[model samples]
Target: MITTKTVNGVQIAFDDQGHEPGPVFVTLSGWAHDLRAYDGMLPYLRAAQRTVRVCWRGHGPDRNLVGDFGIDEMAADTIGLLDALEVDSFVPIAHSHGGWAALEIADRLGAQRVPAVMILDLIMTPAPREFVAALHGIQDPERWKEGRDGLVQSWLAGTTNQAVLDHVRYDSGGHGFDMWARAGRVIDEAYRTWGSPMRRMEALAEPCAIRHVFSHPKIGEYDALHDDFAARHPWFSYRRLGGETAFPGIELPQQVAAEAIDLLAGA
Candidate 1:
């Protein structure tokens, strides 16, 4: 079931897959993505008692987003949703940009209070301004409307999953298919002042069970950061899927879900 809540005047939308029978899991999508981005992974994560998928501030049915689109505010939005739902204990499964907010969520909740966390393909660093600027073109509705076919192929070049391709096609339409340009601009501005999520994660007061998964070896700096953090914190575990692209959860859902299930089991 989908629901909406007004937090600080920003309409935050989420899907609450009714209570089942096991542990609760909250799935958070990356930037420019909606909750459906995790559709492929859910089938493999049925062990969860219940699941809640939340879209970022500018995605899905959420509207009139205002203020700095920083990770801290995003974290507050997640916490607000949790508080509204009265969900005290649950695991967070976050991907990419969502990982930025998720790390802050863990910190805000405190490591000892929350069970564990599963972060997918997240590079915990401040994005370069130029890189963020380059993505602004994606928010152009006209371009997406006319060039979606070719765009989809380019995005899925390394993979051949029709389901994933379809999801990306929709996701790339730019926040509810209408707000990408504004959202992208806000995000680019926010990144300019944002710091490393790695430092935030490392600053956790206590050791908590965390499974950090990565795709693509291009994240050598991130790999090094995780390595150094994990070495110091025995509670943390890190792994890399060398052959996968940025969306391992989409390209390798079953495998990623299995590992996530195992990590959640311990939490």
Candidate 2:
């Protein structure tokens, strides 16, 4: 069922589905993604007794447009939701920016409270300033205010095939269209202010099991950051899901889910 709660004065929307009986799998989508991005992969996660999906403050069903949109704030919203539901422990599975939120939550709760984390297609290092600038240029609020078809297409240009393209075109028309401008600013701000996820990883007082599923393209240097982090942290395991770019979780949900399930099973 779908529900809403006031978290730090923002109305957060979430869904709690299925109840066959085990620890809940708390799923968080990326910056502009809605809960349905994981719909195709939900059935594949037979190991979880229940799956709980949360929409970030400004995306999907949650429409509060004002607040600090940092990943830390997003993590707080998640903690508030968990408290409201009386759920003490969960396995957090996140993609992209959501993966950063997952790391924040683990840091907040400590390693003991969180059993494991599943990170999909998350960027661990700080993106180059020029790249961030390019992203800002694409998502400029004024440009979004004009219209978003082209903007949306620009966001999905390099990393997607037809299926991935179709889903984004449809999904972006919904939540992404409305939130892209603000979401873009938030992300750009994050890159500027928030340090690397590797910093967060090193700051952890106790080590926890982290299963990282990254989309490593055949011709890019993006894998270096991910590789470095995995190599540095003994508890973190890395798996590459072959794709020309990020968004393998969207393009290949079944494979993502199968690997995620294995991670949950302690493989």
Candidate 3:
């Protein structure tokens, strides 16, 4: 089921699936992701549990969105959705950027109150702007010209999954320009203002069970960040995948989901 809810005056679109009577799990996607990435996992996960997937603001149906969209706002959207859905308790399974938001939400909710959290390949500390810039720089200029709908073909061309490609085709068709123009600009400015300064993860006050599905890649900085993170925090149990990245699902959703299921099960 897909539903739209207004929270803090901003509209958020979310999708829910499964009710087989186990722990409720909320799957949060990484930056720029829509709900379709979780489509494959729905069958397997629903058979064992209930799940809800969300598309973060400025992405998918929530693009050109109105509301406070700082990471805190993203977490608030999740909390608001849970209240509306009457979810008793939840297990937050998050990937990359979504994992970051999950931790913040958990922190805000406090450990005893918030649900258990599972962090996919993610960093606990604030990331450097240069690192972020390097990733987006590849398509920055093109974004200005194409907007959302204009970039749909190019975005689809980059992905092998037909569902995700289709998602971009329809869900993001109208608001792509504002997402790139307004939200993208905001994000870039934030990075410029706060670069290389390590923000503490102490904000996450949650104390439930935590696990990690880590990967190692040839990317020197990415691998090093996870290695350092895991080494310092024993709460994070890691299973390293021999590949270019710990989580390449943003670029390889199918492969990431397969690996994610296996890792989550074992964790």
Tens-digit lDDT track of model 1 for 77-117: 88888788888777788886577677678878876546788
Which model is ahead, 2 or 3, in terms of lDDT? 2
Residue 188 error for model 2, in Å?
3.0
> Model 2: which ten-residue window has the lowest total lDDT?
146-155
For candidate 3, report its TM-score: 0.68
Q: List the residue pairs that clash in candidate 1.
A: 22-49
Q: Across residues 172-196, which tens digit of lDDT does each residue of candidate 3 receive? A: 3454333444445444444454432
Could you tell me which 10 consecutive residues in candidate 1 have the lowest summed lDDT? 144-153
Reference-based TM-score of each model: 0.77, 0.83, 0.68
Model 1: lDDT equals 0.69
Order the candidates by TM-score, highest first — what do you get?
A: 2, 1, 3
Q: Rate the local accuracy (lDDT) of all candidates.
A: 0.69, 0.70, 0.57
What TM-score does candidate 1 get on C-alpha atoms? 0.77
Collision count of model 1: 1
Index of the highest-lDDT prediction? 2
